[PDB]
Amino acid sequence: KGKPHCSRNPVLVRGIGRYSRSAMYSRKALYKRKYAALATVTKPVGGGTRVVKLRKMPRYYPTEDVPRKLLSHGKKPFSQHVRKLRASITPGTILIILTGRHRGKRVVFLKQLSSGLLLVTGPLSLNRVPLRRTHQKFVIATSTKIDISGVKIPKHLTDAYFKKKKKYEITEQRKVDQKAVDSQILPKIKAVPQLQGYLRSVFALTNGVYPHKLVF
Amino acid sequence: RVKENDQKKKEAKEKGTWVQLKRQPAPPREAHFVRTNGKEPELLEPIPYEFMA
Amino acid sequence: FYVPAEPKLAFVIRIRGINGVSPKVRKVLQLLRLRQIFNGTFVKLNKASINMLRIVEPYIAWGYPNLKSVNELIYKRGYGKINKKRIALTDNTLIARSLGKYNIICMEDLIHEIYTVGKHFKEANNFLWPFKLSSPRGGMKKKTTHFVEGGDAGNREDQINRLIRRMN
Amino acid sequence: SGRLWCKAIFAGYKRGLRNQREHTALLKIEGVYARDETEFYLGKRCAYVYKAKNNTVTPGGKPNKTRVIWGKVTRAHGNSGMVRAKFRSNLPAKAIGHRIRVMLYPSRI
Amino acid sequence: VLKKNPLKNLRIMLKLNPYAKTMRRNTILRQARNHKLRVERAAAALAAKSD
Amino acid sequence: GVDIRHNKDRKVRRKEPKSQDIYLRLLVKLYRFLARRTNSTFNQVVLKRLFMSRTNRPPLSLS
Amino acid sequence: MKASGTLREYKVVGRCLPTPKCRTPPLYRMRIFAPNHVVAKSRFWYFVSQLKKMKKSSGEIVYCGQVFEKSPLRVKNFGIWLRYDSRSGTHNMYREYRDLTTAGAVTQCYRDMGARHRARAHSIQIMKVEEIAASKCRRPAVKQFHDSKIKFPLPHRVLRRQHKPRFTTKRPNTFF
RNA sequence: GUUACAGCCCCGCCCCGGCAGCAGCAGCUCGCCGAAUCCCGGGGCCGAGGGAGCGAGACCCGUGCGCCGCGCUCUCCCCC
RNA sequence: GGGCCCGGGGGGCCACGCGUCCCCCGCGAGCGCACGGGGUCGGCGGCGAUGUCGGCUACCCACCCGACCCGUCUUGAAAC
RNA sequence: GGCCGUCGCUGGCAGUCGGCAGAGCGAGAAAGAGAGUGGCGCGGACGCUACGCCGCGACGAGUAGGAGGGCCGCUGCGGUG
Numbered sequence A: 001k002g003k004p005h006c007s008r009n010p011v012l013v014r015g016i017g018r019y020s021r022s023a024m025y026s027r028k029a030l031y032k033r034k035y036a037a038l039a040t041v042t043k044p045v046g047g048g049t050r051v052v053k054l055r056k057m058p059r060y061y062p063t064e065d066v067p068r069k070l071l072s073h074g075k076k077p078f079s080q081h082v083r084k085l086r087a088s089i090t091p092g093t094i095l096i097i098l099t100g101r102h103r104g105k106r107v108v109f110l111k112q113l114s115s116g117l118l119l120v121t122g123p124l125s126l127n128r129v130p131l132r133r134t135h136q137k138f139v140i141a142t143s144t145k146i147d148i149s150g151v152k153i154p155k156h157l158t159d160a161y162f163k164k165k166k167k168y169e170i171t172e173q174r175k176v177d178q179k180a181v182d183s184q185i186l187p188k189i190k191a192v193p194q195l196q197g198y199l200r201s202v203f204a205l206t207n208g209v210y211p212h213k214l215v216f
Numbered sequence B: 001r002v003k004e005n006d007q008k009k010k011e012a013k014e015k016g017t018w019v020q021l022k023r024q025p026a027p028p029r030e031a032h033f034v035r036t037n038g039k040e041p042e043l044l045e046p047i048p049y050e051f052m053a
Numbered sequence C: 001f002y003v004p005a006e007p008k009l010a011f012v013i014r015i016r017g018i019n020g021v022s023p024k025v026r027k028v029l030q031l032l033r034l035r036q037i038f039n040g041t042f043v044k045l046n047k048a049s050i051n052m053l054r055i056v057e058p059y060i061a062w063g064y065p066n067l068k069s070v071n072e073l074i075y076k077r078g079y080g081k082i083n084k085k086r087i088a089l090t091d092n093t094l095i096a097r098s099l100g101k102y103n104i105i106c107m108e109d110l111i112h113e114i115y116t117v118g119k120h121f122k123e124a125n126n127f128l129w130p131f132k133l134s135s136p137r138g139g140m141k142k143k144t145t146h147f148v149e150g151g152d153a154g155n156r157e158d159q160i161n162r163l164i165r166r167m168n
Numbered sequence D: 001s002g003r004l005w006c007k008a009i010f011a012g013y014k015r016g017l018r019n020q021r022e023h024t025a026l027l028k029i030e031g032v033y034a035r036d037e038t039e040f041y042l043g044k045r046c047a048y049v050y051k052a053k054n055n056t057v058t059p060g061g062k063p064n065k066t067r068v069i070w071g072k073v074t075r076a077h078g079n080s081g082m083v084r085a086k087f088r089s090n091l092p093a094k095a096i097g098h099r100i101r102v103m104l105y106p107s108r109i
Numbered sequence E: 001v002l003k004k005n006p007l008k009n010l011r012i013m014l015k016l017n018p019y020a021k022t023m024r025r026n027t028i029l030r031q032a033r034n035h036k037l038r039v040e041r042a043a044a045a046l047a048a049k050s051d
Numbered sequence F: 001g002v003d004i005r006h007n008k009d010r011k012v013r014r015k016e017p018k019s020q021d022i023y024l025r026l027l028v029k030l031y032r033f034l035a036r037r038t039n040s041t042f043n044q045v046v047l048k049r050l051f052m053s054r055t056n057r058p059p060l061s062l063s
Numbered sequence G: 001m002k003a004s005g006t007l008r009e010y011k012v013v014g015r016c017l018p019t020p021k022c023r024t025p026p027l028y029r030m031r032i033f034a035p036n037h038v039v040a041k042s043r044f045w046y047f048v049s050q051l052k053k054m055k056k057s058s059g060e061i062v063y064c065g066q067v068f069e070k071s072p073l074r075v076k077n078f079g080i081w082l083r084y085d086s087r088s089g090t091h092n093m094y095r096e097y098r099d100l101t102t103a104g105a106v107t108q109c110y111r112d113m114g115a116r117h118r119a120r121a122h123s124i125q126i127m128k129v130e131e132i133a134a135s136k137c138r139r140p141a142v143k144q145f146h147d148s149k150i151k152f153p154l155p156h157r158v159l160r161r162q163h164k165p166r167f168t169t170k171r172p173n174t175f176f
Numbered sequence H: 001g002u003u004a005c006a007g008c009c010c011c012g013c014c015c016c017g018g019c020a021g022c023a024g025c026a027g028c029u030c031g032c033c034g035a036a037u038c039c040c041g042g043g044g045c046c047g048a049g050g051g052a053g054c055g056a057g058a059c060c061c062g063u064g065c066g067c068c069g070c071g072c073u074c075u076c077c078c079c080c
Numbered sequence I: 001g002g003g004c005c006c007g008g009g010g011g012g013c014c015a016c017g018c019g020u021c022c023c024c025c026g027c028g029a030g031c032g033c034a035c036g037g038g039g040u041c042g043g044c045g046g047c048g049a050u051g052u053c054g055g056c057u058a059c060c061c062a063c064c065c066g067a068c069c070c071g072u073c074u075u076g077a078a079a080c
Numbered sequence J: 001g002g003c004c005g006u007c008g009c010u011g012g013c014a015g016u017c018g019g020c021a022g023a024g025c026g027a028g029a030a031a032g033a034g035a036g037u038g039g040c041g042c043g044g045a046c047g048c049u050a051c052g053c054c055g056c057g058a059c060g061a062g063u064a065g066g067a068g069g070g071c072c073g074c075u076g077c078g079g080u081g
């Protein structure tokens, strides 16, 4: 019985600790921490008491089984993967969603969600784009930012809030959340000159415009 | 070399020092110092051509 | 002036192919265990070895390798001739199981034995299968002439490290 | 309300002089004519759009006659802003000198 | 066994050479310390450009 | 390419008896097991000789 | 030799290895212009085998280091004494260049001997490179740059970068 | 003609005169390198194999993240 | 420089027990992390009953690259 | 790096040894998870046509010619289905 300390030596490089194991032996203080030395349930029957069996043996065996497979190690499921971002996508940046039905719309970034997706809302007043998820890869990042650091994005909306159910009818919670985030963002994009007209516009490549050449 | 190795193997057996008896190819020559004691090295020049024939 | 010791160890890479080779050149190339193009071996130098490398100079490129070249060759292209089979050096138990009778029990013992050419260089080297190196990235200058006359054959002394890194 | 792709020409296949290796395609993206500028397009998804006789299904829409072969810009070719691309089905030689679309969307910005 | 590269994989290297752990722990500490000394000498040189 | 002569890579030594008689093949099934599972070199020689032809196991007279 | 890249200049010294006949053999030094130190040691043994009864296996190289330019920011006048095989006969030349470094002037000499006389690097033996005062120069192409008030336009500036606009609209200017 | 209203070159004495700095982010004035070498990132192609067991013992029949390999916390006690 | 950097008067260490004597000056346990004996997700999105989905191979056509007619005798055959 | 075959290791497996039980023989270091005598719950995949199954390495041009394997093909006979 004890409270857990954190890991003493810092992550110097990935997989390499900053302190060697003698300095770590001294830091843990191991010099003074030496040490030396269901399947059955009885049930009454109205007979006697039977001893019933939990997980009784199977009644059907298929004509052939596959063998078990070996043990790999670094193969985590999706809900335990590490979630990256770019350095160019920061909360407040303006993005260009490229692929969906909102192609080319200049649209405001809110937060990195739990599944890695971008909570992304270029306002429903301007873009006609809701509180919507997008993907990091399928988004170009414009270097045009708002100081959104002082808004209260709600805690209840997360990756399970935007995941599909099964005619899609707009619930009232979508409207209330859209308003409660829209009214917090929209004065900060009105506080910048001509940013709302930039958000109403759509992105288009035109003649002599090459994406390797024009910077944003 | 048979006779000399018999002499070198009977000797240094009671003494116990291990003595090399196989021949060995000519090694790379070991590091050494070269003394330019006083004088500098003489500068060599390609000679110009002159047609003796 | 300090004249350093003449180098005891050479990495020999075969640069020319398998077609149209003289019988004495073919015999010496198969005594150095160079049976493909871009195969490599470590050779210790002495009067016998240097004349064997003189007799096959157009077909080999060789020089005097670095310590880092020994490190990358043993760690990345390092395989062992275990039970007359090419088995990858992925554990020190493999090196110990064959060469432990020479007190060579880890990868570092074998690297020390190859680089600082030891008493048991023959067995640590013959434990190593010939190195299977790729084509030189960037390329060759010219395969057919000597390094001195602007090519790649022959002794390129310290400069074999630029081509080990180019090939390994 | 505009163009969301870049204009590339399917120049030819990856070839030696007397051998062509048609699993790899060669693409000439418009406006890039050096290897310094081709670093943008590597890994971007390329597409050969073409229209045929019979209706085929469209994801998110009604059946049209337009079809595609999707690709991937793999690595730079040559020294002058040419590039290699590798598609799921190898491109027809019907498409030599015709337009393929190099999309922006596998973005690295 | 899949030959993993010891020059890439840190732990295949540590399975083969455990002293590479301290050869690599040193020269992270060494190089960061020398980079601190480089920045500090540059800051003293800029102060001497002021002074 | 590699310069090995593939001339003598196949060793023509006898792997199994050419006879189809079932008792000799049962004795071979017994000594295959004894040859790979004992450390003895008797069983290798006896396994080898149960493969060989009639002219390679000649009759041994009584004397 | 393949006179490749830029030549470097080397101080290669060496000697015959000692016998009990001569206990301490004398050291011989040369100035080798070479791409690298390996071909510089080879070119050393070339000229030493010509001048002495000395081969590589009966001798040794004691020092081989690059000698740098002691003034690489001064434009200087180099006179190079040549020896080259023609198609017919071999010839002696004096020849003048004007570079910052001696290795640069000898690189320029190899390019110019290959240019004018179609002679390749194995024909050419550099025997003497000497930096030369501006009053002692013999060749007029070098002497015309010895003007304190030198002044000239860049008259007909043919433009490069021709394919960056492959298809331009204005014809290019060439007067600048 | 010889410092004058520009400069260049050499020698001697000044601590190799001294202060940077240092094969230079004056991001190219000229090299060889890395046990004297490490970190991070981007693109491409691939994913073959498939009963590796762990702990609990004849005082028990559990369970499949198991070897080698690296090191994390707790079985001491405080402080921020 | 080398001697475990011989010996005496702020950083790092594959260094950690108690006692007896000569000489020199063999069982601690558990729990998570993982560059660790070859890929998985305990992540998803669309379209589908009269006009669409799949079907490499086999039917026809087109394009790019390739490509002379087989047997034979011969040193050599697409051979006038 | 994947797959096909060949060759080699004359490599591995008869150990499917189960309340008549104890699940191992990859491991740098000639040889034993030896036997002795004094001080509740009834369970545990696949396999092995051993002419079979399995695992490692390297290798693969071919005329004339040689040899092997064909669960390639034709016609009749003894058996069998």
Ligand SMILES: [Mg+2]
Pocket: C019, C020
């Ligand atoms: Mg040839």
Ligand SMILES: [Mg+2]
Pocket: none
């Ligand atoms: Mg390249």
Ligand SMILES: [Mg+2]
Pocket: none
């Ligand atoms: Mg030739």
Ligand SMILES: [Mg+2]
Pocket: F006
């Ligand atoms: Mg053959």
Ligand SMILES: [Mg+2]
Pocket: F007, F008
């Ligand atoms: Mg044969």
Ligand SMILES: [Mg+2]
Pocket: I065
């Ligand atoms: Mg054609």
Ligand SMILES: [Mg+2]
Pocket: I072, I073
């Ligand atoms: Mg005929």
Ligand SMILES: [Mg+2]
Pocket: none
């Ligand atoms: Mg005839």
Ligand SMILES: [Mg+2]
Pocket: I074
């Ligand atoms: Mg004829």
Ligand SMILES: [Mg+2]
Pocket: I077
């Ligand atoms: Mg014919």
Ligand SMILES: [Mg+2]
Pocket: I079, I080
């Ligand atoms: Mg004819």
Ligand SMILES: [Mg+2]
Pocket: J060
């Ligand atoms: Mg082959």
Ligand SMILES: [Mg+2]
Pocket: none
């Ligand atoms: Mg064949």
